[PDB]
Symmetry: T
Subunit: 144 residues, 12 copies
């Protein structure tokens, strides 16, 4: 049976590479999903990739990953990283390890992004490598 | 004739008694629903019992209870208790009394759980008796 | 096409005028929608008016306004104004101008309502004029 | 032998129902003691009910309850709830379970009352039901 | 003789469009005064427009507006918005409604500008529309 | 009956004048009691003067003043002024007016003495005039 | 020629008893000036009574009092009490004792009024007796 | 001839070695008193050893030690160490040196125990050596 | 006609060397003005030296310096340094460089003087050299 | 030809796997250096691996890496991560990218470890994978 | 074999008794080393006494003490006590017990000295006895 | 002997001018040393100029300046200015006057640079004039 790895994207990440692309970058959330589905072939794992602007959806998906005995979750909660006690509790309640991922380095941004409810509950964090943040997360998650 | 009492459970409470039961406890959210439906027979009230990982669902349900002239709401908002100005506003907007319930004693935990937006708007609070927190809430709610 | 302007209402605003009208003030969210649809005829713009108790819905709608090349968004996030980093990021990610609206003056209320994640990301803010807050927002939004 | 349950009232609760009774309510601390002594007959437990304006008295009484192998303490520390590290330590030092009780909902009042040294050490808390807060506490305490 | 509307500008607004105009913008405080005097003709109100770098002058003018039974004050206290308890008290002491105005969106700027002593006492606030902030304020003020 | 005025002194005021008088200032708590008893003759009021190092004693005495329909309480809670929520509640619960008194000006001292739980509940405050603080309090208290 | 005592009133006190008098009280700032001029005859002192909405005026007047070898200043800085480091420095720089006066008890009001730059530098403070606050201040000031 | 040294124990220390001794330790407060009386023989000093759950008792005892020209006080105020401005004032008012003692290292515990009103006023502090904390204190106190 | 350099002194500096000179120092603000006018001859610049207790005057003068194309402003805002957002904005709005000057080292004083709204906007700061602080400022200002 | 990558370890990491190994883990800092030297062969890069308890050493090494045109630095500043403004400045001053590494997840520990001066200046961060944190860092660093 | 006890002195302690000795005290760091070497003869232990202005040196020495199976460390980190997370980690990593020592009582000084990273990790603390602080530490350390 | 003046540079100042000079500003730390050595000839003083990335080195050098009876220290502690209690204590312990120097205006930067442990202990501060900050410091230092 093939280990399944949830990759869960929070709000606004669906907008990646749309605002003035010849200024803020060309790469989109689908492009990253395509990269990752291929990396998952190289790594011999299936990868279930989802996005929602809803805090509740990320929790449902964390709980769904435990129900399905998933090997790992790679979680980019986006802005909910800094507000969601509920996502912190979800990660702590489930036995499936969670890896926090950010494209940008949140500590290099606004002070309100220094706070990570995900990071307080997760196994680990990879930040600041753009799409490479996901690819590193998926390698580490395969070797768990 | 029969008074209806909403009993609303927030995120992660659906996971009660699942993770390593012979370590973190056997009793489940359904077991508590079954206890409560029986207590509701002894008390001559119907009891509408619901759970969601979605903050918006608890608000919809608070508003639904006012529309239906419900006698009371027993609310365990779980993690949203500590973040939701929106749930605080919903409780204050509606005329139906709200009783805050927690299985655990939140004041005995992490400092971030000392804050209760629910408690700031509710009639009252029962904490720390596990399932008995709900049973006490339902007695008090019947005598309102 | 007449320019389209999204008008997005957050949680509990659907309860406007219902609770004890002879105390909290008669006028309802529909009444305001009706005022606005008529103002929109005088101004030669179409107006898409929505309400949800769900933080995620407001973000979906902000993103949907950019996808549809809407001219403006008038946003009353209600309690989520004070909690939502995710709405702040949605406003910043989209190119459509956002006008913050409040019926009441939030600075005249509880200290926790002094914080506006919407206001930190929006073009501008109109507060405290009840329904006239929306009408002013719609005039300003038409002239953008 | 009959289980004994201490019920300990802190400062100013002795003044309950005296200031302008036909405005702020008729019921007194004795009336509640009388209610509770009768409930204690129904429940087959003896109940030792005390009040003092002295922080030290509540600690002496907590320690006296352990010495006498009391089944439980119901504690309304009143204002000392928000200041007394010493009462927090007393509860934690003794093996007798403590139930926090408040007539009012302290979270609905001044921010300085949100802090509960009792709540940080107690098994549980019942708040906001007036005299019913004690009666619920005594039921829960009997079933311990 | 018509309703009179005071429009009071605090410190540094007199410098609008002067420093490097082909960089920080061409429009001046006089230009806005001229716009507003014309709008006031369309609206059938007299408009008394004043500027001072002195906190005391804005208070004298608020008090003068009450003495003269003005219909409204439009107040852009500029930096004093964030420091002046005295202007907060002046607004609260007088019966004449005050509308807060800002050219810029202060919530989009330095955290020290998030604080508004004016906004805490005023009827309402219009921010972020440049000169349009005043025009909106004057329309709302006429319909009061 | 001559109106009776309680004058209540908190901890350490009993040490006034004892420690190195030729440095800390000669006058003792008895000397002040003697001054006050004489002033009370000139004013036609009886004066009941007490001191305790016990927070609980000051509360008992506040409550005793209401029971005896005393005209006023002059209260120097000394260090308990900065810690006692329970004294704040006692003052608020009783109908007898309380005047706060300090020998020294506490705002001129350590930041922790800037907080006055007494001052937050009392009618009024006289600070910084040594014994004259009491004498002024007794004149004001007689005229109440 | 007699001891001269400056009595300096800060912003908004000029509005005392004007706004809806049959609601917020009938007595005015002139009435208090008249009371005080008469008390000054009984006490054998000249009294110079002034009011300004300008922080700078209160400083000029404090400095003028030192230049004229005044016996004392009675200062009600009103809102500037809570903001003015400059008035704190003026009091500290001059040799003339300053008595802080408030009509209301500021500790009984909004938390921002708990802060007193005047009180941190003054000899003493009388608060909460309305006009009696000034009369007490003038007696204490005469006996200095 | 013999120097007397007060040794004053605050709340809950009377409970030392009682709760489940074969888990939380065997040694009691009396055992430490017995150790100390013997050490006092070797050191040629009389030792007055007392305990109370009452803040006021520790103050009375500090004041009593000054009145009796005691050489030193060894003070373990327990929880009152973190709350008592009154004990801080008592230590500062008296000329008798005070040595702060703790069995445990309070800096190694909860952040609220990092604050020591005793330590802010005392000569010195010995923490974390259990009973040896007292023995060291008594040696240092004898050589003063 | 030469480069002109404004030197602006805020509140209370006019009192330098007056209060008990044989205690707090003999040198006055005029003495420093005389020093500086002579230094200005050596440096080939005109120097306009002003003092006011009014925050508004310092702003008027900063704006006047820009209008007159002054080379530089040397600003000792005294207490307004720690409160004036308005002076911060004036410095930022004008093109003329501002040098902050203090006689004393404010970082060596009360924590409230650590905050410098002037310093946050100025080119540079010279503190702690008494009159030498001005002389250094004028040399640096001439070589700009 | 060969890119050189500095790997810099701060204080106490030299102690990895020493204290009671059959309890707190077997693997040592050398073991990780050996893993990394081998990975560096597979990756075609030389790897300069160093440790110091001295903040100044990590700065010297950051500066040395720029001077030597190193491709990247992998930095585990250990405790200095939470205190060193100087290391933050060193990373910002140099052009060589820095990757922050932690064995443990610092967000899962004491609140003081949530602060990362390294993270505020670095390209990116890998936390919580033990030795795998370094291996991931070295892959990412090779592909830069 | 003789137990060895490290005694480690942080920055500026090397300057003890040099600044105006006939004012701030005659005794030097060597004098204390000489006292302690003699006490160590009485106690049958060898004592290795060191000082550095370098944070890193104290850590190296803590680690060196574990490597050498030292019985104890007596640590006066001086100013690094209030800043050094790295020294806190060093103490916690090593098995050798650490006793915190201060000549002065840090709680009696500036609020920034109330914080002790050493105290948070150490067995215990002796403060405020000058050189006697070391001698007490060495007795306690011998009896470990 | 010519009076000797230590000029001490902290971490990262050694990188001045190196990184992208055509952006960060051409001038190097050597260039400034050369300027200063020449100024020192004009002033008849010798100048001992040093730099280290080590906090401990700056303290050693402060202490070395006192040992050598240096006339003054000019200190640019760079990032350690904002962290070093130990440098604050070194300045306070030595009798040699210290002048704080910064190239940039730290108050114009990140809030964490507003804190100056050097400034809290130093005679005086010169900030924001680049190399001219040192030159002004050396003139002031010669005249001491």
């Amino acid at each position: 049976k093939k280990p399944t790895i949830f990759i869960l994207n929070g709000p606004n990440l669906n907008l990646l590479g749309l605002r003035e692309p010849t200024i803020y970058g060309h790469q989109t959330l689908e492009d990253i999903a395509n990269k990752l589905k291929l990396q998952a072939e190289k790594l011999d794992v299936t990868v279930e990739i989802r996005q929602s602007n809803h805090e509740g959806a990320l929790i449902d998906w964390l709980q769904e990953a435990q129900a399905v005995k998933a090997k790992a979750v790679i979680l980019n909660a986006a802005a909910y990283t800094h507000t969601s006690v509920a996502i912190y509790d979800a990660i702590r309640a489930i036995t499936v390890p969670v890896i926090e991922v950010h494209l940008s380095n949140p500590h290099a941004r606004e002070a309100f992004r220094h706070k990570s409810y995900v990071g307080e509950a997760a196994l680990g964090t990879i930040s600041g490598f753009g799409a490479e943040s996901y690819s590193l997360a998926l390698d580490a998650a395969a070797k768990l």
